Amino acid sequence: KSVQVFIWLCLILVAWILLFNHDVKRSPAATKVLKCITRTLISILTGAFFWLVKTLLLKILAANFNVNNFFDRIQDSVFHQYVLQTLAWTMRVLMEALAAAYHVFRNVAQPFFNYIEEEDLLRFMIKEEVDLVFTRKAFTEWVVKVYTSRRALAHSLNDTKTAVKQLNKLVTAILMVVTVVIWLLLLEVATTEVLLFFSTQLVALAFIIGSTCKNLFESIVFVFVMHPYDVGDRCVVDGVAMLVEEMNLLTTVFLKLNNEKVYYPNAVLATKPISNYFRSPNMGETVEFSISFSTPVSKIAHLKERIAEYLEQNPQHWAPVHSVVVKEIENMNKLKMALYSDHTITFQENRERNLRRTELSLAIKRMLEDLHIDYTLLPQDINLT
Amino acid sequence: SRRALAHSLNDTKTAVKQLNKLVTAILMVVTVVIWLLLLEVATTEVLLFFSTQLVALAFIIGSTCKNLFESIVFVFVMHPYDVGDRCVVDGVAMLVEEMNLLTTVFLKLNNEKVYYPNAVLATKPISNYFRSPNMGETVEFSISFSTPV
Amino acid sequence: FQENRERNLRRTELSLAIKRMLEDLHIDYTLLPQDINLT
């Protein structure tokens, strides 16, 4: 549409120029109005070119956001469509897009059949498709997680669209003011002195509002170019974790672990480190405990073997890889000990991570209790009088 | 090691490609404006209005391409580290993941992704484990003052 | 230090060796004696 209107306007301008290109001076009054009209056509042509470049910038930004998120958005949409069947166009579909779902899934599954019914999937989709898509409780949990992910993707898309719309409004206002001033200058109504007075007032005001649109530009380049995080991702700033809520050009709203709303200046974040749990791979875990310096090495080996067995017998929560490291020796009476292991998920699920850490700590406590590992304070010698 | 070298080469190629795109856009805008000026279509007053708008916008986007230039001179000229090398910043170790013109992605010991502004790193010390020689070790323990020599 | 896991394991092994060697040598640490006057 933009190129069509641009060609329309340019053809109109050239046609007008050709008609009056001939040197036919109807009257001195006609010349002034003709010059004013031509200046108006040139000014509106410049405005149309500005609009074209503006929409080009907006479209390239939208395409960058698409390459960033629309792939996962379309994947989630396809997964949801496949699940529903078992039980651009992609951008439009994404924009358009618990107990009840679990009940529906259970009803679809054959009675007294915990595993997914192959016949039901086959009748609704091909066997290969069903296998690729693939415990009633596990299926319900997966459906709930997929729905939550789709909702988060929709919220992220809406936030990005709102930010792009606000940026479009701002740049359109800038274009409007630029084109009106361009038309005024072309019309040549103001004399010299007033023009330089306007110029000096303009450089003054330019410094004034530059002191702020510098921060604005930093914020937009931060949110767009670096793109450290998306909506709904858990991030840590200054050592405190929080969840992204709203993406604005000048600010970003975050929710702390205590459901406390926080407002941040986007410009400041550009000068601070940002960590993302959602984008990070499976995260590690650390536990701390201490034992006596007199503990035999055999007990330490037994504890290591028990830890390895416990970790390998629970793959769903902890990966087989693990390590036990001695930190430091305190007066050769206390031996600092720590265990390192990796979850099967990231820190995004804070509640699940905390529960798993508590379970691991309880397991370590029990295992230490059975092994009879004891810690004793340094003996004190007392001389009576 | 071969996989790490391939990843480093790919990251360097991607950074060079992005820099090429940026400089090519700058060249394109420069040449179009040069052609427009040579054609001599605009009159005087509009030319100085364009000039003042240009110096204004130049300050605006300079406030940021200054940091951009600092980041590129940091990643290229100093070249403190490569992809896959373990580095320590502010006393915390991490692993290089992605090399971007404006930022560098690092992974902490807990497999925690971190994003840094490349401009800031230029003003902070950087230590590289991969490029360093064999490292030392220290252990701490205490004994009684009455221990015989 | 690039191999953080290997470095940590080697440090732990060295610490255990130091612990054992100190244990065999019978090196002991004692807190400063405290004098108590009853009433």
Numbering used by the authors:
A (entry chain A): 248 to 334, 387 to 396, 432 to 468, 481 to 731
B (entry chain B): 495 to 643
C (entry chain B): 693 to 731
From the study:
Amongst the Arabidopsis MSL channels, MSL10 is enigmatic in that it has two separable functional modalities, regulated cell death signaling conferred by its N-terminal soluble ‘death’ domain and force-activated ion channel activity imparted by its C-terminal portion. When heterologously expressed in Xenopus oocytes, MSL10 is indeed activated by membrane stretch and displays a preference for anions. In Arabidopsis, MSL10 is primarily expressed in the shoot apex, root tips, and vascular tissues, playing a critical role in adaptation to hypo-osmotic shock and induction of programmed cell death. Analogous to DmMSL10/FLYC1, each subunit of the heptameric AtMSL10 channel is composed of a transmembrane domain (TMD) with six membrane-spanning helices (TM1-TM6) and a characteristic C-terminal cytoplasmic domain (CTD) shared by all MscS homologs.
In addition to the characteristic TM4-TM5 CLD, we observed an inter-subunit salt bridge between E534 and K539 at the extracellular end of TM5-TM6, which is unique to AtMSL10. We introduced two single-point charge reversal mutations at these two positions, E534K or K539E, to disrupt the inter-subunit salt bridge interaction. Surprisingly, both mutations virtually maintained the wild-type channel activity, as assessed in excised membrane patches from Xenopus oocytes. We determined the cryo-EM structure of K539E at ~3.7 Å resolution, which represents an open conformation nearly identical to that of the wild type (r.m.s.d of ~0.3 Å for all Cα atoms). Interestingly, densities corresponding to the TMD and the TM4-TM5 linker domain are better resolved in the K539E mutant than in the wild type. Thus, the extracellular E534-K539 salt bridge between two adjacent subunits in the heptameric AtMSL10 channel is not required for the non-domain swapped arrangement or channel gating by membrane tension.
